[PDB]
Amino acid sequence: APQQINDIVHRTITPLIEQQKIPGMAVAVIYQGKPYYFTWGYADIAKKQPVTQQTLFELGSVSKTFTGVLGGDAIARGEIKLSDPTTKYWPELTAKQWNGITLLHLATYTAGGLPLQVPDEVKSSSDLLRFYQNWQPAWAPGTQRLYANSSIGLFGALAVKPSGLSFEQAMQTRVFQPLKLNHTWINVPPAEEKNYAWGYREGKAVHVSPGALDAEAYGVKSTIEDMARWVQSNLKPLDINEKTLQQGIQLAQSRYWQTGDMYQGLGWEMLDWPVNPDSIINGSDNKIALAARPVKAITPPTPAVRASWVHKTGATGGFGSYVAFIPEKELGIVMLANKNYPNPARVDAAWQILNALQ
Numbered sequence: 001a002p003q004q005i006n007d008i009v010h011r012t013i014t015p016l017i018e019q020q021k022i023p024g025m026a027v028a029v030i031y032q033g034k035p036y037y038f039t040w041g042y043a044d045i046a047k048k049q050p051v052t053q054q055t056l057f058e059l060g061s062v063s064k065t066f067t068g069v070l071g072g073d074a075i076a077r078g079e080i081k082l083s084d085p086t087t088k089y090w091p092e093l094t095a096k097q098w099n100g101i102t103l104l105h106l107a108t109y110t111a112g113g114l115p116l117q118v119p120d121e122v123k124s125s126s127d128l129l130r131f132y133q134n135w136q137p138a139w140a141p142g143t144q145r146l147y148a149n150s151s152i153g154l155f156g157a158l159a160v161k162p163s164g165l166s167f168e169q170a171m172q173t174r175v176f177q178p179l180k181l182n183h184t185w186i187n188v189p190p191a192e193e194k195n196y197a198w199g200y201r202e203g204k205a206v207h208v209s210p211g212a213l214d215a216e217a218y219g220v221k222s223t224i225e226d227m228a229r230w231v232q233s234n235l236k237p238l239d240i241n242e243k244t245l246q247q248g249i250q251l252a253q254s255r256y257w258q259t260g261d262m263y264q265g266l267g268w269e270m271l272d273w274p275v276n277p278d279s280i281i282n283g284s285d286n287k288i289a290l291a292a293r294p295v296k297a298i299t300p301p302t303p304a305v306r307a308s309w310v311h312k313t314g315a316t317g318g319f320g321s322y323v324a325f326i327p328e329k330e331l332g333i334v335m336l337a338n339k340n341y342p343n344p345a346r347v348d349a350a351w352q353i354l355n356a357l358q
């Protein structure tokens with residue numbers, strides 16, 4: 001890789017690994033449309049397996065970006081509309097609090113207070129229905145944003161309903177495959193277990209536990225190569241030959257709501273570039289990102305803005321990931337680690353690297 005990239009990457013990530021005690025890490029910088037990889041440490045401390053470009057990391061919530069696109073693809077196919085009420089695809093949802101709550105609200109965390117976590121006790125199709133029937137919105141729809149798995153996770157599940165495909169099958173067929181993300185999984189197959197890094201929490205090795213709507217909200221695992229490719233796809237969707245997917249990607253980067261200087265897309269979150277570091281850094285901390293906040297509707301939604309910083313953080317009990325890219329500069333970065341460390345440190349590192357390249 002050009003010495004410039006190599007130097008800024010190493011000057012930035014090295015102190016990060018030491019300060020945060022990150023066991024293993026992979027980074028990818030997309031510069032002028034070309035990917036450059038970097039790896040450090042361990043995928044498995046006990047078995048001394050190093051992190052390589054083939055190592056799989058839990059993406060955590062970055063999986064929400066895949067769900068936003070799959071959803072957008074469904075829209076481009078005319079299978080769903082964001083303006084359709086939730087009940088059009090789940091008539092069994094009869095509780096009156098649901099009238100007025102649209103797929104857009106589920107996709108954008110603006111239904112009125114759906115919780116972050118779906119309860120552990122919710123493990124079946126009937127439990128899920130009961131959970132949503134019983135939920136009580138604290139606010140009218142489309143007024144406040146509350147980042148939630150139970151919100152976009154339901155969006156993902158309802159969105160693939162007309163396809164007649166399972167969520168995993170829709171995702172494989174309509175997103176992973178066309179984009180050649182061949183080492184990206186919702187369920188890691190036996191043959192790939194050997195490249196599946198262990199997550200580290202409090203020094204103990206861990207892997208994400210199964211849960212309701214996990215595939216739709218935080219259940220994707222991937223390699224630094226597939227993630228770099230996922231970034232290039234979102235940077236330049238017009239290169240995607242599959243029509244509905246191309247649209248879908250564009251749709252996920254449209255601006256539906258604004259809160260502070262942040263705009264909510266489908267999965268992705270965007271800010272106008274040039275952007276202020278403190279604004280994206282302080283803004284990413286789990287004190288702002290998860291908090292209840294009023295939103296102003298963007299009527300109608302602004303189509304994907306090329307001069308934007310598009311990003312998303314992700315975390316599981318054992319993993320910390322981050323994706324950020326600037327379409328107008330053909331610039332992006334992917335940071336995957338098997339330790340869940342503070343969001344501000346990720347965004348800080350990512351900004352130091354990308355700013356240094358325009």
Ligand SMILES: *[B]([O])([O])C1=[C][C]=C(/[C]=[C]/C([O])=O)[C]=[C]1
Pocket residue numbers: 060061062116117118149211217218313314315316
């Ligand atoms: B992201 O990363 O942000 C996320 C993921 C996951 C969660 C939860 C889970 C449970 O259930 O606990 C959150 C968030």
